[PDB]
Design a protein around this ligand. Structure first.
Ligand code: ATP
Ligand code: MG
Ligand code: MG
Lengths: 12, 384
C-alpha cells in the first residue's frame, strides 16, 4: 500500500 | 553558539565523542551487534543497525534500530542513539502519579474514537512555553504502553548529548510528523525543491550518489505555518522495483539540514526494507512486491507530480546554532499559532539525556490513522 518509510513504531 | 558541529549533525559535540561517551550505556541496554548495511543498496550512503536483547513477556528476542548519516560515524551514532532513546522510553512506575495535580485536557492530544478517557496513570512534565509543571497521561509518555488512551507510539521521543539537544530534536520530530500528517491529508503536494543552490557540499555529494545509482529523487516542500523546514525526499528507482518507492522526511530550522536528513532517511528506508528484519519490512516484502509498480506510482501521484519549483534560497532559515535560542524561536512560533504548550518529560535511564516531547494539538495522523482533529482540514486548505 504505502511508500517505504522509517522513523517510528506504533503498537497495533 | 553551543552548536559546534554545524555541517551535518547540528550537535554540541562530535559523533566520535558521542560514541565514546555512550559505551557504558550501550552495554547497559544489552547491545549485541552494530553493523553497516550500505552493501544491500546501490547508493553508497551509510546505514547502520544496532541489535539489542529484549524480553517480550516470556521469550527472549531482539529489537533492531537503524541509523542514518552522511558518513559512517554519524549513521552508527544515529542507530546507537535511537536504541538508547527507545530503551529509555519503557514504562517506569517510579514516575507514575495516580492522582493528577495539574492534568492536561486529554482531548487536546487528539484522541481516537475508541479512546478510554479514564486515565489512571499520569506523569509529570514541564511546559517550557508557560514555565510550569503539568501532568500528562502515561500512555502519551512511555513506549510501549497499555494502549488504553491511544495506541503507543514513538513520536517525540529523542536522545541527545544534553537535555536541550534532546528537547530540540523531539520538538522538530513533532513538527515534522504534524506537517507530514497535513501532506498525507492534502490532495496535492505542489512545491518541488531544486537543491542546486545548496551551500552545503554534502547535499551535492548525496544527490550525485543517487544519480549514479539510477535513483531519481524528488524533494517536496512540506513546511507548515511555523516556517520550520520540513522536506520529503521521494525515491523512484529506474529498475521499477516497487519496494524502492520510498520516502524520507527531514525537519530542521536550517533548510539544508532538513534536506540532508530527508536524503539520508530515504537511504535508511530503502536499506531497512532490503534488510527485511523488521515485521513491517517483511510484510511489505510479501505483499507490496506483488502490487504493480504503475499502480503504486498512480496511488502516490501527489508525491511525484509538481506545480512549481523553489530554491533552497526561497526557504526559511531561522537556525542560530544555539540550542536555547533555537528553542526560543520555536516556542514563539508555536504560541503564535495557538500551540500554547510545549511539554517535556525527562526519561534519562542509562546516563544519557532522553525525553518525550508533547505538543498538544499537533497532528499524528501520518503515524496513526485513527487520530485526526477537526482543525487539520482548514490547515491543509491554508498551506496546500
Ligand atoms: N550525533 C548525535 N548526537 C546525539 N544524539 C543523536 C546524534 N545523532 C542522532 N541522535 C539521536 O538519535 C536518534 C535518531 O536520530 P536520527 O539522526 O536518526 O534522526 P530521527 O529522529 O530518525 O529523525 P526523524 O524525526 O526525521 O525520524 C534521535 O533520538 C537523535 O536525537
Ligand atoms: Mg526519532
Ligand atoms: Mg523522518
Amino acid at each position: 500500500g504505502r511508500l517505504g518509510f522509517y522513523g517510528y513504531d506504533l503498537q497495533d | 553558539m553551543d552548536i559546534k558541529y554545524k555541517l551535518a549533525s547540528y550537535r554540541i559535540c562530535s559523533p566520535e565523542e558521542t560514541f565514546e561517551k555512550i559505551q557504558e550505556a550501550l552495554k547497559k541496554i544489552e547491545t549485541v551487534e552494530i553493523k553497516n548495511i550500505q552493501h544491500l543498496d546501490k547508493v553508497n550512503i551509510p546505514v547502520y543497525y544496532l541489535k539489542r536483547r529484549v524480553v517480550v513477556d516470556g521469550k527472549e528476542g531482539i529489537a533492531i534500530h537503524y541509523g542514518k548519516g552522511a558518513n559512517d560515524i554519524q549513521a552508527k551514532v544515529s542507530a546507537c542513539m535511537e536504541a538508547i532513546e527507545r530503551f529509555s522510553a519503557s514504562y517506569d512506575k517510579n514516575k507514575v502519579k495516580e492522582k493528577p495535580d495539574n492534568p492536561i485536557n486529554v482531548e487536546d492530544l487528539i484522541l481516537p474514537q475508541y479512546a478510554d478517557k479514564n486515565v489512571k496513570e499520569w506523569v509529570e512534565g514541564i511546559d517550557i512555553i508557560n514555565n510550569e509543571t503539568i501532568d500528562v497521561p502515561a500512555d502519551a509518555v512511555f513506549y510501549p504502553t497499555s494502549g488504553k488512551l491511544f495506541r503507543g507510539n514513538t513520536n517525540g521521543l529523542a536522545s541527545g548529548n544534553n537535555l536541550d539537544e534532546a528537547i530540540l530534536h523531539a520538538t522538530l520530530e513533532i513538527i515534522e510528523r504534524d506537517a507530514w500528517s497535513l501532506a498525507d491529508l492534502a490532495r496535492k503536494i505542489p512545491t518541488k525543491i531544486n537543491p542546486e543552490d545548496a551551500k552545503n557540499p554534502l547535499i551535492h555529494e548525496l544527490i550525485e550518489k543517487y544519480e549514479k545509482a539510477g535513483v531519481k529523487i524528488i524533494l517536496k516542500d512540506l513546511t507548515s505555518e511555523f516556517e520550520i523546514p520540513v522536506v520529503a525526499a521521494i525515491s523512484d528507482d529506474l529498475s521499477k522495483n516497487p519496494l524502492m518507492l520510498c520516502v524520507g522526511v527531514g525537519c530542521h530550522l536550517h533548510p539544508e539540514i532538513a534536506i540532508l536528513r530527508a536524503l539520508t532517511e530515504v537511504a535508511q528506508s530503502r536499506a531497512s526494507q532490503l534488510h527485511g528484519f523488521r515485521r513491517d519490512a517483511k510484510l511489505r516484502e510479501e505483499f507490496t512486491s506483488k502490487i504493480p509498480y504503475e499502480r503504486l506510482k498512480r496511488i502516490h501521484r501527489k508525491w511525484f507530480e509538481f506545480e512549481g519549483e523553489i530554491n533552497i534560497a526561497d526557504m526559511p532559515n531561522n537556525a542560530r546554532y544555539d540550542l536555547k535560542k533555537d528553542l526560543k524561536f520555536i516556542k514563539d512560533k508555536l504560541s503564535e499559532f495557538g500551540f500554547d504548550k510545549l511539554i517535556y518529560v525527562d526519561l534519562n535511564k542509562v546516563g544519557v539525556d532522553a525525553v518525550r516531547v508533547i505538543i498538544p494539538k499537533m497532528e499524528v495522523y501520518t503515524i496513526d490513522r485513527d487520530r485526526l482533529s477537526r482543525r487539520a482540514f482548514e490547515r491543509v486548505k491554508k498551506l496546500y
